[PDB]
A paper describes a structure:
Starting from a highly repetitive β-propeller sequence, we designed a consensus motif sequence that formed a perfectly symmetric 7-bladed β-propeller.
Solving the crystal structures revealed that they possess an identical structure. Interestingly, the different position of the chain termini had an influence on the preferred crystallisation conditions and crystal packing. While for previously designed symmetric proteins, the proteins typically packed in distinct symmetric ways reflecting the inherent six-, eight- or nine-fold symmetry of the proteins, here no clear symmetric interactions could be observed within the lattice. This may be expected given the incompatibility of seven-fold internal symmetry with any space group. Despite the non-equivalent positions of each blade within the crystal structures, the proteins proved to be perfectly symmetric, with a TM-score above 0.97 calculated by CE-symm. A striking difference however is the stability of the “non-Velcro” variant, the least stable for Pizza but as stable as the natural “Velcro” position in WRAP-T. This may be due to differences between the sequences, as the two different “non-Velcro” variants of Pizza have different stabilities as well.
Numbering used by the authors: 1 to 286
């Protein structure tokens, strides 16, 4: 990548890594660090990327106000138009049939893979910064600069507003068993919540804004990305397990391999880095 990497995701078998960048591309990489494809078509910075559960479809989010759907070989399949400002994040439903997009226009939109707008989730009072599907597919979680996470059903009905962060919420993730919700915030914390909206834990330790959060596939490990240039690994009890050091600028996103053994981090230093659960740096994708 020729500019900041803004997001990273692992394919379902973890053999392919997808990276989003301000250079307006998504790049696809093998686990061994070889560049496989560069997906070209967005007209401004790409802000996030997601793999479909089948590993065949890639979704990308962009400042050009669209989501694009791509196949694993780089073909553009759909352009999802409807947001009135920058799209900041994207997620697939667990059945791969629905795409959720987050936008500076203060909404989440829901789309089918044919590109039809299914629903607009309205309620946030400021930019929406990230979106996640519950692993049962029945709930949508959104993160916002209005300092909240909101939970929604597919009907667009607001279910819960999770309040407590003292600054913008930058990202959101469901645990693989759907029992826990993690949120990242400019207030330098990750907070863990249950589905009732109750705060379970506040993870403290990062020295600057937290930009993204992810669960291991067994839900036992939480990874957080920060402007303090680290990824931190945490257990469910909130204990800090590791600090992954090596990026030379802000870390913007993080993801786990499907066996939870490898962590991918995205950075403004224009790289993706791969790490072991032990905290050891493994590889750097440039």
């Amino acid at each position: 990548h020729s500019s900041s990497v803004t997001g990273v995701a692992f394919s379902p078998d973890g053999q392919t890594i997808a990276s989003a960048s301000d250079d307006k591309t998504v790049k696809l990489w093998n686990r061994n660090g070889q560049l496989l494809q560069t997906l070209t078509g967005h007209s401004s910075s790409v802000t996030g990327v997601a793999f479909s559960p089948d590993g065949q479809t890639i979704a990308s989010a962009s400042d050009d106000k669209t989501v694009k759907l791509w196949n694993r070989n780089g073909q553009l399949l759909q352009t999802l138009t409807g947001h009135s400002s920058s799209v900041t994040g994207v997620a697939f439903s667990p059945d791969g049939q629905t795409i959720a997009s987050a936008s500076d226009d203060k909404t989440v939109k829901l789309w089918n893979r044919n590109g039809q707008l299914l629903q607009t989730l309205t309620g946030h009072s400021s930019s929406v910064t990230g979106v996640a599907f519950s692993p049962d597919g029945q709930t949508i979680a959104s993160a916002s600069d209005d300092k909240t996470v909101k939970l929604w059903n597919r009907n667009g009905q607001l279910l819960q507003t999770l309040t407590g962060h003292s600054s913008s919420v930058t990202g959101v993730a469901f645990s693989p068993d759907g029992q826990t919700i993690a949120s990242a915030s400019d207030d330098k914390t990750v907070k863990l919540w249950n589905r009732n909206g109750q705060l379970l834990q506040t993870l403290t330790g990062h020295s600057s804004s937290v930009t993204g959060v992810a669960f291991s596939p067994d839900g036992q490990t939480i990874a957080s990305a920060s402007d303090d240039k680290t990824v931190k690994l945490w257990n469910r009890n909130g204990q800090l397990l590791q600090t992954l050091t090596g990026h030379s600028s802000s870390v913007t996103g993080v993801a786990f391999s499907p066996d939870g053994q490898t962590i991918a981090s995205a950075s403004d230093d224009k790289t993706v880095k791969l790490w072991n659960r032990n905290g050891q740096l493994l590889q750097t994708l440039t």
